[PDB]
Amino acid sequence: GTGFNKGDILFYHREFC
Amino acid sequence: METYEGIIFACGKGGLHEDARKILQYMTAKDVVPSSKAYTGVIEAFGQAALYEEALVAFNTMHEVGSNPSIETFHSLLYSFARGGLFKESEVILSRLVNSGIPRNRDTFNATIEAYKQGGKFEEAVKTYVDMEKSRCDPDERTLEAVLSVYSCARLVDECREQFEEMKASDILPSIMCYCMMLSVYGKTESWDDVNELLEEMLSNRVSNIHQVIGQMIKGNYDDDSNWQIVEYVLDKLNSEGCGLGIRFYNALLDALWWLGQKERAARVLNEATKRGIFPELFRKNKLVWSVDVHRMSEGGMYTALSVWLNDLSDILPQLAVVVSVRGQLEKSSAARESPITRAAFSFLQDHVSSSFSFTGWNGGRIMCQRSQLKQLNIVALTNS
């Protein structure tokens, strides 16, 4: 039954502007 | 740790960006997390050679490794941005400081002063001076030197000599600066009597040796092969406090020499400064671009550099000969079009090599000359008064 078959870049690097 | 910081600080003081970069890569290759002081040192090293993008990249990497910025990092950032006239970056960093809550010392105020001075914003410079006096703290010699330079640049003789007589009353042994741009401003209006009356006291200079040597050589008494050696040793001795002081010393000397009729002497001073290490961005020679950078120079320093750049062009072909009048955020705007640096360079080129050096249709702070206009091109007469 139901038991069958076992059931960070890009940051701190932005454009300064 | 100590060795890395010492080497990096020495390179930053001496303007050795390449050595600091090599040390940074070598020490990062050994799984060593850099400290804030070493990062500040490499950032200020990059700013000496006007490599703003590398300094900004290092500053951005500073936060990535967890190294928070310090007061020295901000001081280096403002000084580097002020040397180049990038006042937009100056106010951006000022806003960063104001939102970070760190108090502003004399360094921030005077860095802003010369940032607006190099950018030509005299009115904002004096406004920031009056704001500096409004709040607190006592200006040092650097602040009054910067205001004397900005007064001399903006055709203000009277305030210049007022500040001169006010500052020399403190018994402070007035430096090479004051004398240099005083000769410059007196040569602006052909004040030969004032120039001579300053030189009479200048020549003796019983106290110091540097003033005596420079005062002797400006008049032409040290132009001989044996008599230029004293100037060369004094220049070598002066090349120990750092490129930050060297650039200012050469700027003042070049302005004085150009504005006193000593064009050949100014050219030779610029030539000996180039081999020293000061103004490393001055000249670029390759098959593509033949460039001269003047955004960190004064009006006098620009004219001497342009004079020797034009002469070298006529000797010889690059696809383009360009003049970097304004470098920074101002390029992508019409503000750099009106800037004193840009208009001065354009007028100099217009009256010297006719209508050949045109503007750029894409950049607001560059003077352009295609190879075709180079094909149809001693141009500037360098003489001693």
Side-chain angles (χ1 to χ4, degrees):
Chain A
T2 43
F4 180 80
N5 211 46
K6 290 182 66 69
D8 187 280
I9 328 166
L10 314 180
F11 211 67
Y12 314 114
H13 285 290
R14 68 166 67 233
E15 194 195 16
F16 187 66
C17 164
Chain B
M1 183 24 81
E2 162 182 349
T3 47
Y4 297 146
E5 168 53 41
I7 294 181
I8 282 183
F9 203 6
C11 295
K13 190 264 304 172
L16 289 197
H17 56 279
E18 171 194 340
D19 304 85
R21 145 137 48 75
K22 293 294 276 151
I23 292 308
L24 191 68
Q25 283 107 37
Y26 148 76
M27 142 192 159
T28 313
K30 301 322 175 248
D31 303 9
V32 176
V33 162
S35 61
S36 168
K37 45 178 175 61
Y39 267 146
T40 295
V42 293
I43 284 153
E44 64 143 22
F46 281 147
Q48 299 279 328
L51 298 157
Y52 310 101
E53 42 79 57
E54 270 166 3
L56 283 178
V57 161
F59 172 73
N60 268 324
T61 326
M62 261 207 48
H63 316 91
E64 186 67 37
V65 303
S67 298
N68 304 323
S70 69
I71 178 155
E72 178 96 331
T73 318
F74 295 129
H75 288 357
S76 314
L77 266 172
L78 283 315
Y79 279 141
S80 314
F81 291 149
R83 262 177 282 167
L86 288 83
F87 62 92
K88 279 185 92 79
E89 282 83 355
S90 312
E91 35 83 2
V92 164
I93 299 283
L94 261 206
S95 179
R96 194 260 206 289
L97 262 290
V98 86
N99 61 58
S100 180
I102 330 168
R104 330 90 180 278
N105 61 334
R106 159 212 59 251
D107 280 323
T108 56
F109 296 124
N110 73 356
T112 316
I113 290 321
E114 70 250 10
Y116 278 114
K117 156 255 180 300
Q118 187 56 261
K121 291 335 281 149
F122 175 56
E123 41 247 68
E124 208 78 11
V126 293
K127 241 79 182 283
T128 40
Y129 198 142
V130 86
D131 296 323
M132 185 294 129
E133 313 326 310
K134 174 254 311 169
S135 57
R136 179 73 289 141
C137 322
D138 317 323
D140 283 350
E141 283 302 281
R142 181 148 191 68
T143 324
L144 48 91
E145 158 58 26
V147 77
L148 208 56
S149 306
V150 84
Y151 276 147
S152 170
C153 287
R155 268 286 186 126
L156 281 198
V157 190
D158 56 283
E159 293 103 335
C160 257
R161 35 163 194 58
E162 190 269 334
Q163 187 51 264
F164 199 68
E165 61 101 14
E166 183 162 7
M167 74 102 189
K168 67 198 311 209
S170 296
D171 281 26
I172 52 175
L173 203 61
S175 59
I176 292 161
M177 272 60 237
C178 83
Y179 286 106
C180 274
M181 88 309 295
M182 278 328 195
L183 321 195
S184 321
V185 69
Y186 286 151
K188 290 175 90 168
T189 77
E190 227 298 323
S191 308
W192 221 234
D193 296 334
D194 268 18
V195 169
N196 267 15
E197 81 99 15
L198 270 193
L199 270 157
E200 279 296 325
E201 155 207 348
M202 159 46 144
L203 290 191
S204 64
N205 202 68
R206 190 66 196 188
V207 185
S208 184
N209 173 209
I210 61 187
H211 299 258
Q212 162 211 340
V213 174
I214 61 168
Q216 294 315 130
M217 62 67 162
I218 53 184
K219 216 167 284 190
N221 330 304
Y222 280 179
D223 293 27
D224 301 275
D225 287 351
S226 39
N227 300 131
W228 199 249
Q229 302 244 316
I230 174 165
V231 190
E232 95 167 326
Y233 333 121
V234 70
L235 278 152
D236 288 339
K237 182 188 174 182
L238 199 37
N239 196 241
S240 62
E241 334 287 332
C243 296
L245 287 78
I247 179 182
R248 289 191 286 102
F249 160 60
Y250 279 125
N251 267 336
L253 180 53
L254 283 185
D255 188 31
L257 279 182
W258 173 260
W259 263 356
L260 280 203
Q262 308 310 307
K263 307 179 164 187
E264 179 73 24
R265 194 147 315 130
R268 83 179 296 190
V269 158
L270 178 73
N271 191 275
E272 61 66 5
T274 39
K275 29 188 142 178
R276 182 137 300 129
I278 312 296
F279 294 122
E281 80 281 353
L282 191 51
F283 300 130
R284 305 186 56 90
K285 312 283 187 65
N286 46 63
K287 187 118 55 204
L288 295 170
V289 150
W290 268 42
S291 83
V292 46
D293 205 326
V294 293
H295 74 283
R296 293 204 298 170
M297 296 197 152
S298 59
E299 185 160 6
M302 143 188 288
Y303 291 167
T304 67
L306 270 169
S307 60
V308 311
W309 186 62
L310 263 54
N311 295 329
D312 221 328
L313 248 68
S314 37
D315 291 8
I316 69 180
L317 205 59
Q319 292 279 107
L320 153 62
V322 71
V323 172
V324 189
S325 58
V326 167
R327 156 89 188 91
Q329 179 122 329
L330 279 314
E331 302 162 45
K332 39 188 173 179
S333 63
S334 51
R337 296 291 334 170
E338 64 66 5
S339 163
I341 307 109
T342 327
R343 59 164 71 138
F346 159 61
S347 205
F348 199 99
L349 288 145
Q350 192 34 62
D351 81 359
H352 263 275
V353 290
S354 173
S355 325
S356 60
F357 271 75
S358 58
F359 308 133
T360 56
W362 53 87
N363 203 286
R366 310 288 166 83
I367 263 56
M368 224 273 285
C369 206
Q370 309 94 1
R371 184 147 70 107
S372 65
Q373 272 75 316
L374 259 300
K375 259 100 72 181
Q376 51 86 16
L377 201 139
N378 171 36
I379 308 178
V380 181
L382 296 158
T383 37
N384 297 101
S385 72

